Each structure stands twice: as C-alpha cells, then as structure tokens.
Design goal:
Strand order of the largest sheet of chain A: 1-2-3-4
Radius of gyration of chain A: 13 Å
CATH architecture of chain A: Roll
Number of helices of chain A: 3
CATH topology of chain B: Four Helix Bundle (Hemerythrin (Met), subunit A)
Number of helices of chain B: 4
Distance between the termini of chain A: 26 Å
Number of strands of chain A: 4
CATH class of chain B: Mainly Alpha
Number of domains of chain B: 1
Oligomer: heterodimer
Number of domains of chain A: 1
Number of strands of chain B: 0
Amino acid sequence: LDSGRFSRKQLDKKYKHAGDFGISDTKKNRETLTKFRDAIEEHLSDKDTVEKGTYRREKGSKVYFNPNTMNVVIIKSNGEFLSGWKINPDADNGRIYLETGEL
Amino acid sequence: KMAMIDLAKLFLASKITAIEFSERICVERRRLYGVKDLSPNILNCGEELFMAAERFEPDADRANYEIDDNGLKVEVRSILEKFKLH
C-alpha cells in the first residue's frame, strides 16, 4: 500500500471515506485499503478529474475534483495523499467549495 | 433522519469515543447523502460535524490545525449549538 503518494497508515485512517469511492466493503484490511488506494489513483487519473481549490488548513494542498462522482481528493504540498470524500452540492460547504474552491 | 445529530449527542455524552464518532459519522453521512426531504439546518449541521471529525487525529504528533478528543468535543458541541440542536 505505502508506495508513491500513498502510505498504509494514512490510507488506514482515511478508509472511513472509501465508501464515497465505490468501495462498500465494511471490513478494513490490507485488501480493502488496496481497493481504496486504487479507487483514489483511478480518481486522480480520470480525464474528468481536474485540480480545483485547496484544503486551506493544509498549507499548499491541492484538491482534485471529479464533476461526475462529485468526489475530491486532497494532496499535500509534497504530493502525499491527505484525504478525500464526496462533495454535497446541496450543503453550504459543498456549494461554497464549488463557487470558491475553498474546501 | 437525525442519525448524525444523534451520533454527535452520543459522542458529547461520551457514550462513544472520538474515534468511534469520527468513523460512524462517515457511515451516517453516506447514508443520508442525496436523501430528499432533508432539513437545510440539519443537513448543514451534519456537514460541519463531518468536517470537524476530519480534523480529529488521536496521535500526539497531529498537525497544528488537527484536534484531539477534547477539541473535537468542544468543536462538536459548538456546531450543535450553532444550529440550535443541543
């Protein structure tokens, strides 16, 4: 798991978000974290996914948004995967991110 | 429903831990996501609780913007009050 912009540790603590990336497996093990790791890369790779805004909290983090899944993945200034989840356009936080890029 | 508001109260009551609260809150948000007939106030309250949980990190070496058990509790209580759901 921990190879590239990913680490097993970070993936583990963020698996709680995997359900937003099409992975409903309620179990958290090496094999599921893997599907999580994969669903993230596939997200970043999608042609429809583009950089949009940042997670102010994390200094120079860049966030990649996919208008289809409405998901966002946060990458730290150093390219390390930070976190990610699905944007809710009906919620003020979601719309604010959409209008201003501030996550 | 108010599964998220309930979780928050359960957390503030210390019936569940910050770690527990931070995980179940994601399950509840996913569940209620997209569901129609939702109350704006309740919807947004749930959103802020979700973002507060995102800042929670049990490890002592957490980032400066991240928070611990206490801190999440303060943040959560503050969020419920903000939306008048305490």
